[PDB]
């Protein structure tokens, strides 16, 4: 049979926390992608000015 009103309330509480955690993760990982690209690019950039050379 269907969950009681209280059982649903518990599902919602756990679902909301999970949703908050998933957002935190995506946010973390999204920032991590950005920092990885920045690092790759700084490398590309310092590589150019070095190949320049003398």
DSSP-derived secondary structure for 19-35? HHHHHHHHHHHHHHHHH
1-54: in CATH 1.20.5.10: yes
Judge whether 14 and 21 are in contact, CB under 8 Å: no
Taking CA atoms, 51 is separated from 4, 32, 39, 46, 48, in Å, by 70, 29, 18, 9, 5
Place of tokens 């490398």: 43
Cα 52 to Cα 21: distance, rounded to the nearest angstrom: 47
Cα 14 to Cα 25: distance, rounded to the nearest angstrom: 16
Contacts of 45 (CB under 8 A, 6+ apart): none
Q: Give the length of the chain.
A: 54
Cα 38 to Cα 54: distance, rounded to the nearest angstrom: 26
Which experimental approach was used here?
A: X-ray
Cα 40 to Cα 54: distance, rounded to the nearest angstrom: 24
Residue ranges per structural domain of the chain: 1-54
């Amino acid at each position: 049979a269907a969950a009681s009103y209280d059982q649903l309330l518990k599902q919602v509480e756990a679902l909301k926390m999970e949703n908050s955690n998933l957002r935190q993760e995506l946010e973390d990982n999204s920032n991590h992608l950005t920092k990885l690209e920045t690092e790759a690019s700084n490398m590309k950039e310092v590589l150019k000015q070095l190949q320049g050379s003398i």
